[PDB]
Amino acid sequence: SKRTAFVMGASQGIGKAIALKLADQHFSLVINSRNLDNIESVKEDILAKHPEASVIVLAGDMSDQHTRAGIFQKIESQCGRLDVLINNIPGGAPDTFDNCNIEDMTATFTQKTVAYIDAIKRASSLMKQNEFGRIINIVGNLWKEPGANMFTNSMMNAALINASKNISIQLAPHNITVNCLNPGFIATDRYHQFVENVMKKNSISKQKASGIPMKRVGSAEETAALAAFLASEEASYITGQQISADGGSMKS
Amino acid sequence: SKRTAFVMGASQGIGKAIALKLADQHFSLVINSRNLDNIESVKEDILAKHPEASVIVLAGDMSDQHTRAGIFQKIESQCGRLDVLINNIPGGAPDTFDNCNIEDMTATFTQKTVAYIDAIKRASSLMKQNEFGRIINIVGNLWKEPGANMFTNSMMNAALINASKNISIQLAPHNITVNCLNPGFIATDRYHQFVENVMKKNSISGIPMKRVGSAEETAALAAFLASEEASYITGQQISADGGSMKSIL
C-alpha cells in the first residue's frame, strides 16, 4: 500500500498482467495506456478484487518526450513518491537488414530505447527520495533468432541490456535495483500478435510446407510473477540481471 | 585478383594506419576524411611509401546521410567494384548515466551506429556484384570500465556488435564477411585524444584506466581479416587492446 508502482502499457498483454499481479501484492498503482481504451476495465478488474486498492489512471504515449515528462511530474504531485517502474513499450515494426531504413530505425530508437532511459532517469529521481526502487525493463526477443526478422529491435534490445547493467551500478548505492526481463512471445499482447502476423507472411519460402521462425514461448502471468518477485522487498540484492521467462515449448 | 578497399576516417589515427597497411598488401584504395587537404596529404604519404599504389580520395563526413550516399555513388562510378569496407567513425562525447542526455543520444546513434549499417548496406550491394566482401567495423572501448564514463557510447557499441553479428548471418551466403574490431586506446587518433582530454579534465576535477592498443597491430589485424584466407572468419569480435593499462592521470 505504501509502495507505489508505475506500470506502462497496462491496458493489455504484458503490462495488464503485471498491473494485476502488483495489485494482488498490495502496491498502490499508477497505470498508463496510449489512450483510455480498455484501461478502465483493468482498473475495474483491480477494484473488483481489492475494493480499497489505490489506482491512478494516467493516459498518454510514454514514447513522447514531453508527455513522458508530464506523467512523471503528475506522479510526483499525486503520489509524492515512486517505488517501482515497469518500463514496457513495444519496439518498432519488424524489419530486416535488407529492408531497414534510417527514418524508421531512428524513430524506433527514440520510441523505446530513449524512452526507457529517460523514464529511468525520472523515476530514479523520485525513488532516491525514499532510498528504494525497483526498475524492471521489459526487453527481449520473441524468436530464437531475431536478427533475421527483428533486426532493429534486436540491436535496440542489446543496447538496453548494456545500458541497464551500467545504470544498475550507478543506482545501487540508493537501494534501487535495475533488471531486464525477457518475456519471450506473449500471445495475449497485441504488439506480439502484430509481429507474428508479419512474420507468418515473410516466412513463406517454399511452395509447400530448416529456417522456420520458432517462438520462444512465454506467458503474461509467468512474466508477471517474476516481475512481482523482482519488485519485492526480498529481491533487494538482485540487480543488473537479465532474466528470461521464455521457457515454454516453442512452436512455429 | 585485385581488390579495392574503402577506408573511412583515414586522414589520421586508426584509419590512416589501416590505409597504409592495405596499401602495403596491394589493395587499391579509396580513402576518406572530412577535410580534403588532410586526406590528400595521406594519399601523398601512401604514394611516398608505395609508389605503385592506386589511391582515390573522396572527402566528406561519412556521418552525414546525404554525403555518405554520394560517396558510395562515386565509388560505384569510379571503381565499378568494392571488396573491402573499413567502417571507422568516432562515437559521441564521453558521458555518464547521471549526466547523459537525450538530444545527444539520438545524434550519437545516427552518427556512428546508423552510419555503419547504411554503409554496409551500400557496400554489400557492390560487393555482391563480384561475390566477395570483407567488412571490418571499428568498434572501440578505450577504457577498462567503458560504461562508467562512456555511457552512451557503450550502449551503441553493444547495438553494433549485435547488428554486425546479425548482418554476418545475412551476408555469409554472398561470401561477404563481417567482423568487429576493438583497437583500444590509440594515442595518434584525434577522437581518442579528444576523449582523453575531456575525461582527464573531469578527473582532475574509479580512476579511468586506458586499455592501450597499437595502431600498427590494429592495422595488421584489419589487413588479415580483409585477406583471401580469412573467408571463414565472420561474425567475430576481436580486441587488440592488450597493451599495459595506463592511468589517465
Contact across the interface for B163 and A155, Cβ inside 8 Å = yes
Helical axes B115-128 vs B65-79, angle rounded to 10°: 20
What are the cell numbers at B94? 564521453
Strand pairing class (B133-138; B176-182): parallel
Q: Count structural domains, chain A.
A: 1
Do residues A97 and A141 make contact, with C-beta atoms less than 8 angstroms apart? no
Å from A137 to nearest chain B CA?
15
Phi, psi of A60 (to 5 degrees): 130, 160
Q: Which residue has the cell 475494493?
A: A51
Q: What is the resolution of this structure in A?
A: 1.8
Task: Determine if residue A153 is left, alpha or beta; phi over 0 gives left, psi from -120 to 50 gives alpha, anything else beta.
Answer: alpha
Interatomic CA distance for residues A138 and B91, integer angstroms: 27
C-alpha B245, offset from chain centre: 22
Give the number of other CB atoms < 10 A from CB of residue A48.
10
Give the residue among B62, B45, B89 at the shortest CA–CA distance from B189. Answer: B89
Q: Please report which helix (H) or strand (E) contains residue A13, including its range.
A: helix A13-24
Quote the Cα angle for A219-A221-A225, to 5°.
120
Domain assignment of residue A104, given as a range: 1-252
Check residue B114 and report its DSSP letter. I
DSSP string, A65-115: HHHHHHHHHHHHHHTS---EEEE-------B-TTT--HHHHHHHIIIIIIH
Interatomic CA distance for residues A196 and A202, integer angstroms: 10
Give the residue among A5, A167, A171, A174 at the shortest CA–CA distance from A81. Answer: A5
Do residues B181 and B214 make contact, with C-beta atoms less than 8 angstroms apart? no
Interface of B with A (CB under 8 A): 65, 96-98, 100, 102, 105-106, 109-110, 113-114, 117-118, 121, 147-148, 151, 154-163, 165-167, 169-170
Strand pairing class (B246-247; B209-210): antiparallel
Amino acid at A12: Q
Q: In what order do the strands lie in the sheet with B84-87?
A: B55-57, B28-31, B4-7, B84-87, B133-138, B176-182, B237-239
Interatomic CA distance for residues B154 and B9, integer angstroms: 20
Is residue A155 helix, strand or coil?
Answer: helix
Contact across the interface for A158 and B156, Cβ inside 8 Å = no
Reported as half-sphere exposure (CB side, CA atoms, 13 A), residue A12 has a value of: 14
Interatomic CA distance for residues A99 and A77, integer angstroms: 45
Strands (E) in B88-210, as ranges, are 133-138, 176-182, 209-210
List CB contacts (< 8 A) between A147 and chain B: 162, 165-166, 169-170
Contact across the interface for A118 and B100, Cβ inside 8 Å = no
CATH number of the domain residue A106 falls in: 3.40.50.720
What are the cell numbers at B64? 552525414
What are the cell numbers at A136? 524492471
List CB contacts (< 8 A) between B96 and chain A: 170
Å from B37 to nearest chain A CA?
30
Task: Determine if residue B87 is left, alpha or beta; phi over 0 gives left, psi from -120 to 50 gives alpha, anything else beta.
Answer: beta
Q: Which distant-in-sequence residues (6+ apart) come within 8 Å of A119 by Cβ? A: A8, A62, A68, A72, A85, A87
Contact across the interface for B166 and A157, Cβ inside 8 Å = no
Strands (E) in chain B, as ranges, are 4-7, 28-31, 55-57, 84-87, 133-138, 176-182, 209-210, 237-239, 246-247
Amino acid at B210: K
Strands (E) in chain A, as ranges, are 4-7, 28-33, 55-59, 84-87, 133-138, 176-182, 242-244
Q: Which distant-in-sequence residues (6+ apart) come within 8 Å of B105 by Cβ? A: A114, A117, B152
List CB contacts (< 8 A) between A162 and chain B: 147, 154-155, 157-158
Do residues B33 and B11 make contact, with C-beta atoms less than 8 angstroms apart? yes
How far from A75 is each of A9, A54, A138, B175, B200, CA to CA, in Å?
Answer: 16, 13, 21, 54, 39
Query: In chain B, which residue's Cα lies nearest the Cα of A162?
Result: B155
Do residues A134 and A83 make contact, with C-beta atoms less than 8 angstroms apart? yes
List CB contacts (< 8 A) between B163 and chain A: 97, 151, 154-155
Contact across the interface for B170 and A147, Cβ inside 8 Å = yes
- Optimal mutation site among A141, A160, A166, interface B, most CBs of chain B within 10 A: A166
- Optimal mutation site among B95, B105, B137, B237, interface A, most CBs of chain A within 10 A: B105
Strand pairing class (A28-33; A4-7): parallel
Give the residue among B4, B68, B15, B5 at the shortest CA–CA distance from B42. Answer: B15
Is residue B152 helix, strand or coil?
Answer: helix
Interatomic CA distance for residues A231 and A234, integer angstroms: 8
